[PDB]
């Protein structure tokens, strides 16, 4: 992949083979998304989750919830991929965190980005203030926070008011990723994803892991692929068999529009040949990520 990135830098195709990829998408049916009584569920009109790859909520009333399971099989990881959710979704939002037991949910939108809600206020900002979810009987309470540079881990206490169970769960909120745009580089997006992996959200023994950003497409899928291909490249005889627009193309069969733009493409690039150097053998990179991530 590193020449592959060099051969495409040098003649400047990046838009060609971002373009490619859109045009060899998966087309999947999306007819619950479209049931005329879950506009109001939907976020942008143009952004749905397949139907075979939905989450399903487990209430009677209306299971529809605008999120997918890429559940990629050779990688032995599954992501919940959601749009930033909307006023009257966020009970929701949090009764899919439960059911499907999620320790870990990825933030990487803020919720008002150039002058416009992206996204709700699903979560409290002040302990004192816990937020009840009526709807689904779910409450949701802010135990501490942890505030860095450029993201924000917070524990939250979610609490399942029909069955008196407790659990906790783990935002991380990147808050300096902008719509359409990447990473200030390869070390802060990395130094974030790792600090993801070493807090056991992504694990096997929890639930598929919720990302999301505005529509949980652009910047949701650059964090997803990447992740993912370094899991493909540390699993693989060969960590150099990796081809990065072929496990987009994968990703795509489960949830439409993943990667945004050529850019954020070409920095999927840049984090996944930089993150290898973790997965070669060399753990200090990790370290030297954190330095130049300046999260102080
Ligand atoms: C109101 C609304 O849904 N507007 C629609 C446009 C539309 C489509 C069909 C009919 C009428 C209007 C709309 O803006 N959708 C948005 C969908 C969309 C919103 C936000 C992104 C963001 C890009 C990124 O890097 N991260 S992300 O949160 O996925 C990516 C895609 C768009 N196309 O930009």
Redesign the pocket.
């Known amino acids: 992949m590193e020449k592959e990135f060099e051969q495409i830098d040098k003649s400047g195709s990046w838009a060609a083979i971002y373009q490619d990829i859109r045009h060899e998408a998966s087309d999947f049916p999306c007819r619950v998304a479209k049931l005329p009584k879950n506009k109001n569920r939907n976020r942008?009109?143009?952004?749905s989750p397949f139907d075979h790859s939905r989450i399903k909520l487990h209430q009677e009333d209306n299971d529809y919830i605008n999120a997918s399971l890429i559940k990629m099989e050779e990688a032995q990881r599954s992501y919940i991929l959601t749009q930033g959710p909307l006023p009257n979704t966020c009970g929701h939002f949090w009764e899919m965190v439960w059911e499907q037991k999620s320790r870990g949910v990825v933030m990487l939108?803020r919720v008002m980005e150039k002058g416009s809600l992206?996204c709700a206020q699903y979560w409290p900002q002040k302990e004192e203030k816990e937020m009840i979810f009526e709807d689904t009987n779910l409450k949701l309470t802010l135990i501490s926070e942890d505030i860095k540079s450029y993201y924000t881990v917070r524990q939250l206490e979610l609490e399942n008011l029909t069955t008196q169970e407790t659990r906790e769960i783990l935002h991380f909120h990147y808050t300096t990723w902008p719509?359409?745009?990447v990473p200030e580089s390869p070390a802060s997006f990395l130094n974030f994803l790792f600090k993801v992996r070493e807090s056991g959200s992504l694990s096997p023994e929890h639930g598929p892991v919720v990302v999301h950003?505005?529509?949980?497409?652009?910047?949701?899928g650059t964090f997803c692929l990447a992740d993912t291909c370094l899991l493909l490249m540390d699993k693989r005889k060969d960590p150099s068999s990796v081809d990065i627009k072929k496990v987009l193309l994968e990703m795509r069969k489960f949830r439409m529009?993943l990667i945004?733009t050529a850019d954020?493409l070409r920095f999927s690039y840049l984090a996944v040949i930089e993150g290898a150097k973790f997965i070669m053998g060399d753990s200090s990179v990790q370290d030297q990520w954190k330095e130049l991530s300046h999260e102080d």
Request: charged share 25%; glycine share 20%.
């Open positions: 942008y009109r143009d952004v939108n992206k719509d359409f745009g950003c505005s529509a949980g497409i652009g910047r949701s529009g945004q954020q």
